[PDB]
Amino acid sequence: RPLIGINDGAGARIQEGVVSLGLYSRIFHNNIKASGVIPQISLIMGAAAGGHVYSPALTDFVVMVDQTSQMFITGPDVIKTVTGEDVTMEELGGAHTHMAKSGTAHYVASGEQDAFDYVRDLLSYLPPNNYADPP
Amino acid sequence: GDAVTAPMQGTVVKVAVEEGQEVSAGDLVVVLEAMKMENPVTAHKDGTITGLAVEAGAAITQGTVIAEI
Amino acid sequence: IRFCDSYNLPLVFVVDTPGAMPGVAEEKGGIIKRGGRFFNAIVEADVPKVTVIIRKAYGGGYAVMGSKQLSADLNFAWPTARIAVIGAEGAAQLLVKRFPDPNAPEVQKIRDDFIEGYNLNMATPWIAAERGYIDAVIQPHETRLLLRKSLRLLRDKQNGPKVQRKHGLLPL
Amino acid sequence: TNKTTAELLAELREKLELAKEPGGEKAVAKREKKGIPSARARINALLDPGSFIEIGALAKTPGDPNALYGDGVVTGRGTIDGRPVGVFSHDQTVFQGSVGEMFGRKVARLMEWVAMVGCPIIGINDSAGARIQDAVTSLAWYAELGRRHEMLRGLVPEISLIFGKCAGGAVYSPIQTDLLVAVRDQGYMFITGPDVIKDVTGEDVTFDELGGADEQAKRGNIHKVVNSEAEAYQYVRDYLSFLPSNHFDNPPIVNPGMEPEITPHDLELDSIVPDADNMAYDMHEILLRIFDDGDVFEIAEQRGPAMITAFARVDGHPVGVIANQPMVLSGAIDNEASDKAASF
Amino acid sequence: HEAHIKVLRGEPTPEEMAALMAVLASAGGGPAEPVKKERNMWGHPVDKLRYSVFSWQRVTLLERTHMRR
Amino acid sequence: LYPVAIPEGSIEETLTDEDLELDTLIPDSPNQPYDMHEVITRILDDDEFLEVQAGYAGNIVVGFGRVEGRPVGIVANQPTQFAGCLDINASEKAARFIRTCDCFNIPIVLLVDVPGFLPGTDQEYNGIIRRGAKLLYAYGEATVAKVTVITRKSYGGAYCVMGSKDMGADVVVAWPTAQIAVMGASGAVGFVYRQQLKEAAKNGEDVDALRLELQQTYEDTLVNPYIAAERGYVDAVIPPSHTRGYVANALRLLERKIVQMPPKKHGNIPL
């Protein structure tokens, strides 16, 4: 059956140890096993940071919210420290950036209800799995 | 080309060469402290160190020319 | 269970058991191999497996009656469920094996205080729920429509990865 | 402020030598007062010299300051007679050998390893009760370990060595395996111990009457009973010498082509059967003559002794032999002879 | 033992009854011949998948999909 | 295969001096880089390494060699280039190499020394999210034998990408110098103690010395292989010289892997 992930999180929980990295590895591995088996859709509805970005990247469709949502691996403070570049979190990881430049987003919704309408439209074309007959 | 260039923004903690020194390919030319790594930057070809444009302690920016060779 | 698996009937477990029955006659009767066959059949079956726990689910009873660890798909408990390695009276007797003067006045007091604490804190749904060994604790009236929703989800379940081979051996 | 690479390697070597005896002298003392060998010494005695590679020697129960390395089990891989095997061995010096979280995860990792490589697995079991400080974790991990037999049953040969009181939930994993070998007066296997039987049901029963090795062999829960651990190890080596490493591969071929002519030992068979139909005889006098040599390796001798189930070799290829034993109960097929033959 | 249409409130006259039923009968759209459709497994999706040589789905997906009738 | 005269005995019994040279290879200061070819050529037979695509994305080294005559694909972080950070180009290079090996049953060995992903806005705008996930997909899909040797750093998302255990690394071993953590201690202390660094800043204390003290305490507590070995994410912590023995054992045993992936026409790797 299709899997919808709604993603909104500051990456690994730093007080928990490497265990967070083990669970991230297992989540990615399951997205890879499911890749080409079931429709995987990722909604991004806040700042997804660090580990939270590769799971959407491995899913089939990524839907973002125009300026409420962001994705980035490395935060602005680290980019400033290493490279000197001042960048806002919106300019670094905004939905417009990932549409127009990175090519990672498939839709930029005007709001959360628009994002849900696009996810329902997407699902309306897809079968539930790679062997069921389509609607 | 005829430029050793800084591969990333970093702080010069060593310059391993003298103006007019002959250097072989793979020779160390500078050390830049960047990303918490004392990165070596090396001569990409046999040549002579000329126009050297670094000194110790300076922060230098990416793409800065370090020496001609 | 093996027959139902062969004819693809989904399996619903309705647990309420203290586990295997103790006794020398049951030991001599083969209870280890028979229980091992029950454990084998539950894991072998590929059909959708859904479990509802009512009241007691102790030890091997919890495990064998379609636990999540033995490949049950969805696990629900009524709020009366009691999931533990052993029931309160058995844990109390296992403690009273130490300083074992059961004629004493106070031991029969601390027994009941221990059983009260154990039935409040240990033999409950809540540790299994907070650890995720069971997927929901439900109001009892929800059960019929919950089972419909669950088995409709599981209608197409494919079990795997499994290595195809002549057969799986079982305790015999 | 930062230790050198030499200091870090020296710390590693000290930590590994500590992790070889996690209980320390306080638990070594009690083990050696009981005279039993350590969980690693058992593995080293079973496996080929120096072949053992240990996996998860530095595992610990997560977030617990009290935890000891290994979590109560030694797990890894090696060879027997140069052929790969997985092995695990309970270590009663750490938390009594009780099943913890990392105990479970280590043995599960080993079972998944042997299922992926396709090689036999030997489990040296001596104690694996619930961990008194966190028993519902032991409840979960008994089932998490039990499930992974799904990967092994009928794919790779499984062996259990019963070197202690296998009690409670500890019995339900061994009983899935293909061969149980128990050490007499040392290995025991039972669900509910004498004390709980006594105070729930009133009966009196000793450990031998309840679940001693000889009793469980006659009841057919144990496939072999031996007088020492070394005899158990050799019995495992012999047993594995008749088998492929997995469902797919071939067995070893041992001494093919011997004695291609009719021998005196063949001609002895013309008169081996007694003249009168009421007589009886030991079937082994036939079995020792009709196969390539006397290496008729019997399994479950004591269970249903009216039936012989054994490995033998024909032209060097192993075969399973099912034979009646007229010497016992006139060779009638009893309940246990039937289920023994079906299982074999 | 059939499930009949029911009118729960009021009584229509025979003319109103005829109009109600006539419009509902007209609304009874469909194939005009509902029967079990012709089976044609050519190029069914389950034949397109890659199965490992030992994959259990060769039993529980591929074979059952072909053999089910 | 080539037939090889494989020695007999334990790994520690069968060490060559060329193996013992690994025990002193890693510099004492974690800011000093080293050439990863010094490891690669010592674990491979005859030093013989066929490097693939050597001139591109030099922050990762990939190529073929043999271990006891069995071909292997090495993939290895290169501390001398961009401090070994993963970037777009190294990710695509390693993803294509790993998938080329897995097509042709060549097992892969990762030598891991990665501080994380390379910072920069141009990495985001060129799609490091989309294109780094290629190396995740390729490694998670690969069903040949996959062995991971961790040699100093393995941090954050790059720990997951460089063949973590739950990505299905069949054997993971770590040298004593390994450092496995969510992030560098400088950032971790700047997060987990941001409370106490407020209290100290309000008190006007030497917050710089307090950061240094907390960072030391964090580094000594958590930035080591042992927390991952305790979780069982590292199968063994080993003297560096054992590396060749552990690899050779793994690749001999995993010559056929009985592993499978759910039926599909093909996957949907990010492009």
Ligand SMILES: CCC/C=C/C=C/C/C=C/CCCCCCCCCC(=O)SCCNC(=O)CCNC(=O)[C@H](O)C(C)(C)COP(=O)(O)OP(=O)(O)OC[C@H]1O[C@@H](n2cnc3c(N)ncnc32)[C@H](O)[C@@H]1OP(=O)(O)O
């Ligand atoms: C296509 C192919 C497909 C095929 C696939 C199919 C395959 C799949 C198969 C799937 C298989 C599924 C597997 C599911 C597993 C079963 C579920 C497990 C859970 C349980 O079902 S249930 C756990 C176990 N657990 C209890 O029950 C506690 C209740 N218990 C009892 O039921 C018994 O009674 C007993 C015997 C167990 C307890 O035994 P004991 O009470 O432990 O023993 P004791 O007192 O004699 O001695 C020790 C104690 O005393 C102290 N002590 C005494 N003497 C000495 C001395 N000399 N020196 C030092 N200390 C000493 C010491 O401290 C210690 O303490 P502690 O008490 O151990 O903590």
Ligand SMILES: CCC(=O)SCCNC(=O)CCNC(=O)[C@H](O)C(C)(C)COP(=O)(O)OP(=O)(O)OC[C@H]1O[C@@H](n2cnc3c(N)ncnc32)[C@H](O)[C@@H]1OP(=O)(O)O
């Ligand atoms: C794979 C490994 C990795 O990716 S390491 C990831 C490390 N990430 C960070 O350091 C994030 C720090 N900044 C952030 O808060 C987040 O990046 C973003 C997404 C920007 C959220 O910012 P904002 O909405 O302003 O939240 P905030 O800074 O006010 O923090 C609110 C509460 O969230 C918590 N939080 C956040 N991230 C983590 C984390 N990774 N681990 C643990 N806790 C985290 C903060 O501690 C804070 O808690 P509290 O509400 O102050 O009690």
Ligand SMILES: *C(=O)CCCC[C@@H]1SC[C@@H]2NC(=O)N[C@@H]21
């Ligand atoms: C050191 O002072 C902190 C900044 C450097 C952080 C390093 S850079 C390369 C890795 N990628 C990342 O996001 N953090 C790591």
